[PDB]
Design a protein around this ligand. Structure first.
Ligand SMILES: CC(C)(C)NCCCNC(=O)c1cccc(Br)c1
Lengths: 119, 121
């Protein structure tokens, strides 16, 4: 089963995919999803991408203070003290982001759906 | 004219769990409600009573500090640091202090209620 896997998942109409983990199979094509901020709700399998981690060379959106739409490209992964960090490139400069800060727009997530979509 | 709190950073309650998350007030929307932009980019209307006008969360406040696979780890704010447009909190838990980004610091209902009289709308 998919329970216990880390994923990115879309929960609302806004359409962005956020880091979380499948915590329960709740039937009817649906999974209980615990987002990294501690919010838990049911989501559709079609709105879950089985990325852990998001692959190198993926275009993503990298959250930081006052930045809600900052696109960049994954160029590295680092595990440190039980936590995943992404190295994200934007305009020839790389910065580190914790897992929970890396999200995907609907368009960005659609690029991964064929290969990683739970369905 | 203008509502005094528009554009200010706050920590605001999410009804589904009662936890307060970092965000900002984008506007007043009447009937005692405000449009709240959370740091993850989610926007929705929130009652004033569910908003704490903390920027930053005060020294010696008990908070919940998010890290990978940790959803309920309590700690205490012992310092603040702003670098290149980003606020960090120094969070003491047991025998270590560690720096957390603003959006990783949240408050349970009980933790947020301890700030309500001084900082609540
Ligand atoms: C609306 C609410 C409760 C702030 N977040 C919904 C769940 C998905 N969001 C997150 O995992 C998240 C990611 C980064 C920062 C924050 Br604040 C939250």
């Amino acid at each position: 089963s998919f329970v216990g896997l880390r994923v990115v998942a879309k929960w609302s109409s806004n359409g962005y995919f956020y880091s979380g983990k499948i915590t329960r199979d709740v039937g009817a094509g649906k999974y209980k999803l615990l987002f990294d901020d501690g919010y838990e709700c049911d989501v559709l399998g079609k709105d879950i991408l089985l990325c852990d981690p998001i692959p190198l060379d993926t275009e993503v959106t990298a959250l930081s203070e006052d930045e809600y739409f900052s696109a960049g490209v994954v160029k590295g992964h680092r595990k440190e003290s039980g936590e995943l960090y992404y190295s994200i490139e934007k305009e020839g400069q790389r910065k580190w982001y914790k897992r929970m800060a890396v999200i995907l727009s609907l368009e960005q997530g659609n690029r991964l759906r064929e290969q990683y979509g739970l369905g």
